[PDB]
Amino acid sequence: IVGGYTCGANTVPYQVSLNSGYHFCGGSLINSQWVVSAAHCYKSGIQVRLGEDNINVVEGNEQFISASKSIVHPSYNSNTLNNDIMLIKLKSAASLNSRVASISLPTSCASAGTQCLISGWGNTKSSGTSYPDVLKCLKAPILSDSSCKSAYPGQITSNMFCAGYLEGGKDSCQGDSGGPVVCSGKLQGIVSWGSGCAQKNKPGVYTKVCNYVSWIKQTIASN
Ligand SMILES: [Ca+2]
Secondary structure, three states, rough: EEEEEEEOOOOOEEEEEEOOOOEEEEEEEEEEEEEEOHHHOOOOEEEEOOOOOOOOOOOOOOEEEEEEEEEOOOOHHHHOOOOOOOOEOOOOOOOOOOOOOOOOOOOOOOOOOOOOEOOOOOOOOOOOOOOOOOEEEEEEEEEEHHHHHOOOOOOOOOOEEOOOOOOOOOOOOOOOOOEEEEOOEEEEEEEEEEEOOEHHHHHHHEEHHHHHHHHHHHHHHOO
16 A cells, blocks of 8 residues: 555454465455455465454464465456456354454445545555555545546446546555455455556556445355
8 A cells, every 4th residue: 555554453354464475465354254355366375364463473363264265256357357356265264353354245336436445565655665564554535437437548347446546646556456445334346456556647446346246145155
């Protein structure tokens, strides 16, 4: 996250770190056995780390649970990042408490101008590189579809939305991928893509979660 703030330990209790020997992507806990992330975060050998603040120190509220299964969306296109969403099932159920909690799925899509909370352990620099040890947070608004499409002509589908600041300086970034965009208490986005990070006229592009709720519910009901 570029231009963000230190969240505060376990203030974002649905935030997970995906670990394959190192932190590589974020995700969101949607019930005791399921995590939502980005399909472009796919890899084998995922361990899901819940209750994290400092990803490099064991502080005492973590739960480390191996994935039993990953399910990339059936229509994921890695070239366009259309349908950039994946479900991860945990080998055992997480213990839900004040530090480890699930986030609601939307029933209705989010509106332009809504301020959302984006979080992760991604790069904090735009140009140059610095990864944090503790969870960073960013408040960002949803941008109009017309502005989003103007920023990325010929690249935005109806399964994407833009959030952030056209002036630049505040954005999610590499390493934040897969993590949450929460608006009015609902998981409405997944950190997906963007041209660089925090660049002028290049906002972040997010997977539009509300278009996938049917698929998420059906998949969880069958696996
Ligand atoms: Ca830790």
